[PDB]
A paper describes a structure:
Kod-RI is an engineered TNA polymerase that was evolved from a replicative B-family DNA polymerase isolated from the archaeal hyperthermophilic species Thermococcus kodakarensis (Kod). The polymerase harbors the A485R and E664I mutations required for TNA synthesis on DNA templates, as well as the 3′,5′-exonuclease silencing mutations (D141A, E143A) that prevent the removal of newly added TNA residues. Phosphonomethylthreosyl nucleic acid (pTNA, also abbreviated PMT and tPhoNA) is considered a possible XNA candidate for information storage in cellular systems. pTNA is an unusual example of an XNA; it contains modifications in both the sugar and phosphodiester moieties with α-l-threofuranosyl sugars connected by 3′→2′ phosphonomethyl backbone linkages. X-ray crystal structures of the post-catalytic complex showing Kod-RI bound to a DNA substrate that had been extended with either two pTNA adenosine residues (ptA) or two 2′-deoxyadenosine residues (dA) were solved to high resolution.
Kod-RSGA is a more efficient TNA polymerase that was recently discovered by programmed allelic mutagenesis. Similar to Kod-RI, Kod-RSGA contains the exonuclease silencing mutations (D141A and E143A) and shares the A485R gain-of-function mutation necessary for TNA synthesis. Additional mutations include N491S located in the finger subdomain, as well as the mutations R606G and T723A, both of which are located in the thumb subdomain. Primer extension assays comparing Kod-RI and Kod-RSGA as polymerases for pTNA synthesis on a DNA template reveal that Kod-RSGA functions with higher overall activity than Kod-RI. To better understand the activity of Kod-RSGA as a pTNA polymerase, we solved the X-ray crystal structure of Kod-RSGA in the post-catalytic state following two cycles of pTNA addition to the 3′-end of the DNA primer. The structure resolved to a resolution of 3.01 Å, enabling a detailed comparison with the equivalent structure of Kod-RI TNA polymerase. The conformation of the pTNA nucleotides in Kod-RSGA strongly resembles the conformation of pTNA in Kod-RI in terms of torsion angles of the backbone and sugar pucker. The biggest difference between the Kod-RI and Kod-RSGA structures extended with pTNA is the structural rearrangement observed as a result of the R606G mutation found in Kod-RSGA. In Kod-RSGA, this position is mutated to a glycine residue, which allows Y594 to form a strong hydrogen bond to the same phosphate group previously contacted by the R606. We postulate that this interaction may also be important for pTNA synthesis, since Kod-RSGA is a more efficient pTNA polymerase than Kod-RI.
Residue numbers in the entry: 1 to 756
The structure:
Amino acid sequence: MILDTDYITEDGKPVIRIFKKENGEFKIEYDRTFEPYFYALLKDDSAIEEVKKITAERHGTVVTVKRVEKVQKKFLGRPVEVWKLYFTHPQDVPAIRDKIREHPAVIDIYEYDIPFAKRYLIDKGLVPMEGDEELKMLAFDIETLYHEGEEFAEGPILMISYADEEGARVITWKNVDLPYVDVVSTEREMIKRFLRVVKEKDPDVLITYNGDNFDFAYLKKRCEKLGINFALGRDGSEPKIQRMGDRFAVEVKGRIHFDLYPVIRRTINLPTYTLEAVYEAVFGQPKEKVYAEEITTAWETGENLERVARYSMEDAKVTYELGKEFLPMEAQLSRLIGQSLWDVSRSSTGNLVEWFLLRKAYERNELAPNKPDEKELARRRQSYEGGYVKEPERGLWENIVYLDFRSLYPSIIITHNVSPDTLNREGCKEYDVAPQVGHRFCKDFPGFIPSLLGDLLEERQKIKKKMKATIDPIERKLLDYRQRRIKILASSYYGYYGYARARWYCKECAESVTAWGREYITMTIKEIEEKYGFKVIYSDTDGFFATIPGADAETVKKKAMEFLKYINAKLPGALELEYEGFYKRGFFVTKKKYAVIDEEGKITTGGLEIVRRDWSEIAKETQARVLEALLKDGDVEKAVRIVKEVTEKLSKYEVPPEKLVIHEQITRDLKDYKATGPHVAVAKRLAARGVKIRPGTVISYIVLKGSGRIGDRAIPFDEFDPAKHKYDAEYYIENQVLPAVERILRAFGYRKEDLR
DNA sequence: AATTCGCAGTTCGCG
DNA sequence: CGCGAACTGCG
């Protein structure tokens, strides 16, 4: 199985290293025969000679164009003559590429920014994370000495905990009488001890939690001041810290540093992404937190050091149990994109799609288009029309069916071959024309993108089939992870079209897809009202809720099924309305604010506060019991006696503060907030005491009794002392609970005023 | 650093 | 200075 790739230099020449685990065994294949290159497009072939003479300086070294090669490729399906420019060393490319594109005789250059090792995996058609190979995983977390205002890592590391299938231990340099704590004399011995453990456990995967921004920058700076060789790598190297713009990320050669923090971000939407939060969110058992100053004083006074022990022990234990769950999922995502687990696990949705297209593009001899420079990214400004959203018949309805399309936007792409290479291609025999916007899409050949979309969805379909007939439950779970990722890969195509930074961005492709979507959704709605007498209560992009007023619970179901038969015959290609489910009751608040309950009693919400991190758990909780009292019980009164009793629990301060915390995210540098709400209030006030505040931090604040701006009374939740803090009850009534149930209960002749 | 669509609370500035 | 828009966050 392939694990990662990189290169080392050997006498000025690159050497690809491929890290394999072929049957329990770590192996390193070396490839000295791979040449870094990029692509040039010229005015005449007669320019190649003046281009080849182009030369650049690196680190005192002179950079030359090794050799040139003429090739034919397809740029956007058109045949294009291009000169492949070859180089002796990968680091030659970023030096010279600029000085080449500025040549008069060169129109542009392409695939000039592919990481040598990633390019190896493409060009050679190699795929990471492939095979039956069980990986040895080790998680680890640290604890540090935190005194405020200190520089980063000035204070020593107090503990280093780690976990695997055999359990957890903690390495520390004070006495703690716990059978899983190992005592040593000095912070240095502890580090060199942990360094030994990793060497003799020889894990394939090193699992942290935010190790890219904390645990590995500390372990490095401390290894600096203490002067320790941090030979974690299977080749003996130190953790290689890399700068991914905003933050950092750490690699460890011969292994896979699996930082879960970026995995949980992309994969799960949670209120806060603290390790403690995430562990309770994934496995349902609590995990208590121990805060920095508690760690400090407990370490200094030498008291209650057992408590800091189990915190650290449970940081490592959780982090393994977590990495255990999320690793195969990201293993299959690695296999699907064709790039290292380390890479994809840190990648955004757009980057994931592009690496996959970059692979397919190379397989189909398609010159990849560049990424937009500043100007092109500016002309990628004006937006397009999205879906059709129907201003709903606000209120409660009974006996309801939700019908939607099976994969509207991917199915539209395959059906009408929406692809930048088919868009308006002259000289075809057949075209599909897109509504409202009228782009022509050539039908004579499958487009680049639609060819992949179909291949994906078909492959997804074979997989489910192999799942159901397979016998190896390890295999089944893996397959399942793959197709779920294929689903999400498929369903990431339309956005990629309108993603302003994308290499294959096609605005035209994107608005086309939404224009069709609206024709298909609108026509299906007219044909269910006029032709089949349903009433369309609400409709959003790819589906609608409908009912036949006054008809039976089991009539509506049946006549719906009849309309599927009807409408599907009328829908071209893979377009297809399907029966999603039936809901004995459903309340519709506004556009994109709804809640249906099925015949079993499960309640599903959409756009509702009950599911937002920026609303307090007391609101979301009360709104839910409100939704139960209507949909599940029909008790409109109880839905008011519930609010009337919850408001009294706040006016008498009888409700836990832990419910009143509001979580919001920071999306920029604090210097860039044109206007300061309450989370930037606390954030500014927090980084003023010196805490790191990245774009992405979740501020978890609470609103205190007082007057004025909401922010002037906000405090981060950790600083909340209930004995010397009276939280603002009036706010959590008139700004948090009531406005979240008042829209549901105004529909019954109830005003906020008869809700306290 | 996937898209458009849309609700709404906080703040501040305008008549 | 009551109200509406800019700013913001997030499904």
